[PDB]
Design a protein around this ligand. Structure first.
Ligand code: FZQ
Ligand code: FZQ
Ligand code: NA
Ligand code: NA
Ligand code: NA
Ligand code: NA
Ligand code: NA
Ligand code: NA
Lengths: 461, 461
């Protein structure tokens, strides 16, 4: 499944989706195309159910006639009114019982052929419906700025620190003079473009950030989560769009698998087919993994700002879909990322991403863009998104009572899910280097010193 | 390049290799097959050099004739005696100078065609020689025990701690009862066999081990080294045996690459084509990486828990040193002592074993394994391997040593290289769990507590 069909079948729900499509600069007509494909699909299902019941009647009639030792009959030919009736879903059980054993055996096979034909029609309509559902965005939060272009369209929500600060050397120049980063042909001729080696103090800083970030989230009630870095094609397909297979995901062969681009992928996939009857407390995971990205879509080629391989500590929340609880968690998650950057003393701004720039799963997204003083620019360090029930529909992670036997339950409920960067390690190191540089090297932010043998500064070579 | 040919061309050197082959229970005749392949190769090179010189003589002779306005000649037809002479490498320049311009032009083209054919023959002979060299073992150290089978042949050299104590639960049972390890279908249906999720206290323990292990080597003068996790086919081929591609290495497609099985692979490859004139101090690296192994040779062995998984963190010792005065043998002793001191600091009992000649991999001239005591499993299990690869890997990656001056003509010196596990993280976690178990959970070894928020124990759920 891509999305549950239930909201599309509801008049109010379909209007809510069309409005959200318009507000995202996406196509509202996709809603109408899904409704039409589902209408044809429901017809195949109505005919399937009618004909499966008629197959059972044939089996029961053959049994009754053979137990009563009745002769098979003269013909196996089906009357034209019988064929017309089952093709239209109007064949009655009384007309079937009037047939002889030979005809009942023929009719059971013909009805089985019709069910096989209807299943192929149903599968083609499911493929059409699912492909259209891939172009349906999550319902926008009402606070999302309406604009197509990120450059002008995003809204600045908050700022921290000296965001006009200027510094001498950029992160590339700093990491070169430290002698602790190698992005030369000695590395790229071994491992391809955007590959790197870190040495000495920069590796100590990398480990200090990993450990400090994990502890930062443990103190806030998150459970550390270390995932497999591979996902099979079918499972990856539930947690990644088709454009990610082309532009972002490496394929691994040992079944063919894909390297994860973020711990968000295996954490979301870990909840596939689950059902939580209540979530009085949300599930909070502190994802820790290496991330692998093809970066196929020559921007930021220098240093370790945008590399294929990088560590990232992630916030991931699974919560009740009721009373807009996920919207409270979104605010906590961006506040957590902000508190983290304030503890490192990195200046930044928080932006509310415009409607035309949001990926399909996000109902709302906040980015924290840190100020790079030598580069003289705000650069994305963090994305925090509320995916409401969008990913939960794709992985089938249910919530609350099941429909059957519960008179008050008329809708299939799904958990809400959110994800938010806590620390993307290599890009944070670039930001630290620019912000903490001196003529002697890079000063270690105070909070990280106990995490790297009390080192106060890493020196230029 | 696989091995340097110099030792094979020397009568004494060839006998040293043959003797080492016999001592390893390997084929001594491989030395003779290499000499023969090299004899045929040297013949293609003698003819190539002779014919290249004759092409230059043709060009100079045409130039002199054109300047003098000598008639171009009656025919371009080459005397059969001339063809026979250049095919045998006996054609003299004085005879070439007797030809007319038309014959000199024809001969230059014929000689260029011969050079092209000889280059194809040389390529085939180089491939043959290289395939045979892969089956040549490194020259064994004189102290290596001579035996085929590890069970009886390996020698126990040292023991530490209580190696007879028994315990109730094995590492699998403990990690299950902690509720901190998931190896169920929720994980294997998304990531395949031997895949896992770690949660909570076990992730905190994993990070504590990574950071403590890195600091342990920093205090001993090793430089932290964080490598790329991919290597191209050609580069991986210089640091991995043929059997590793089939049994151990995952292929990545983004130019085809391979995931690293250990940071030893990219650290050795980082030294390719390098030439250190002197190494008054050795190069000491503390490799830190995730490791990826297909474990195809295991075939349903150590399937349970995280003892032998496809993906695991490992902290590695890697040394590049002078090939002179038996220095690398002093480094091997220091490296195994470092791994011993590390396990003593964790309070883990173990034995150190000197690996017999028949069980050594081709690159190792000597290897020590540290096998820790698993009290509930009731067995010594390998946690560490420390090898002196002398100049074997250096010949493959072309890492030279010694005076490097203008005017030096055709004994080539190579650096020595050593590698040794400091901590294989998941396997050390299994060992800690068995040794530190109580009725309530797992006690955290004292030295790791500051690396995991002062936590003294992780509790059963
Ligand atoms: N090659 C790259 C690509 C990205 N990044 C950094 O990862 C952060 C999260 O990536 S995300 O794609 O914006 N969202 C996610 O992955 C969500 N799971 C939330 O974490 C970015 O904000 C950027 O700072 C990098 O450092 N190198
Ligand atoms: N699937 C697996 C396979 C191995 N290991 C652990 O890696 C150690 C080093 O591996 S090595 O293959 O024995 N040598 C090396 O890789 C060298 N570079 C020295 O480190 C083993 O001694 C074992 O304890 C594991 O934990 N899981
Ligand atoms: Na300012
Ligand atoms: Na810059
Ligand atoms: Na982003
Ligand atoms: Na109901
Ligand atoms: Na066991
Ligand atoms: Na080993």
């Amino acid at each position: 499944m891509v999305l549950d069909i239930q909201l599309f079948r509801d008049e109010t729900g379909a209007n809510i989706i069309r409005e959200s499509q318009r507000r995202r600069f996406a196509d509202p007509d996709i809603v109408d195309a899904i409704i039409e494909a589902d209408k044809k699909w429901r017809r195949t299902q109505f005919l399937t159910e009618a004909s499966k019941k008629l197959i059972n009647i044939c089996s029961k009639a053959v049994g009754a006639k053979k137990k009563a030792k009745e002769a098979d009959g003269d013909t196996s030919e089906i009357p034209p009114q019988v064929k017309e009736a089952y093709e239209n879903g109007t064949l009655k059980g009384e007309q079937v019982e009037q047939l002889c054993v030979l005809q009942l055996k023929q009719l059971s096979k013909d009805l089985s052929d019709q069910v096989a034909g209807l299943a192929k029609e149903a599968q083609q309509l499911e493929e059409e419906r699912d492909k259209l559902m891939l172009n349906v965005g999550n319902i926008l939060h009402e606070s999302v700025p309406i604009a197509q272009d990120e450059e002008t369209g995003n809204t600045v929500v908050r700022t921290f620190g000296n965001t006009t600060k200027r510094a001498k050397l950029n992160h590339v120049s700093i990491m070169e003079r430290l002698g602790m980063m190698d992005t030369s042909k000695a590395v790229t001729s071994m491992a391809g473009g955007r590959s790197y080696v870190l040495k000495g103090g920069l590796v100590q800083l990398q480990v200090a950030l990993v450990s400090y970030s994990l502890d930062f989230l443990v103190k806030r009630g998150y459970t550390p989560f270390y995932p497999p870095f591979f996902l099979n094609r079918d499972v990856m397909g539930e947690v990644a769009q088709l454009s990610q297979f082309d532009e972002e995901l490496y394929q691994v062969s040992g079944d063919k698998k894909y390297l994860i681009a973020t711990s968000e992928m295996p954490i979301a996939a870990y909840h596939r087919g689950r059902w939580f009857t209540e979530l009085k407390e949300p599930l909070k995971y502190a994802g820790m993994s290496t991330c692998f990205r093809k970066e196929a879509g020559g921007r930021d080629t220098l240093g370790i700002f945008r590399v294929h391989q990088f560590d990232k500590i992630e916030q991931f929340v699974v919560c009740s879909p009721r009373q807009e609880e996920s919207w409270r968690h979104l605010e906590d998650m961006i506040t957590t990322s902000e508190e983290f950057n304030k503890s490192l003393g990195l200046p930044y701004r928080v932006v509310n991403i415009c409607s035309g720039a949001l990926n399909n799963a996000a109902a709302k997204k906040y980015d924290l863009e840190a100020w790079f003083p030598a580069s003289g620019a705000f650069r994305e360090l963090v994305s925090c998104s509320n995916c409401t029930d969008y990913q939960s529909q794709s992985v089938n992670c249910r919530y609350g009572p099941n429909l059957r036997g519960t008179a008050a339950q008329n809708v299939k409920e799904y958990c809400h899910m959110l994800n938010g960067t806590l620390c993307a390690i290599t890009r944070t190191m670039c930001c630290i280097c620019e912000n903490y540089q001196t003529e002697e090297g890079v000063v270690i932010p105070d909070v990280l010193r106990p995490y790297m043998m009390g080192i106060e500064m890493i020196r230029f070579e």
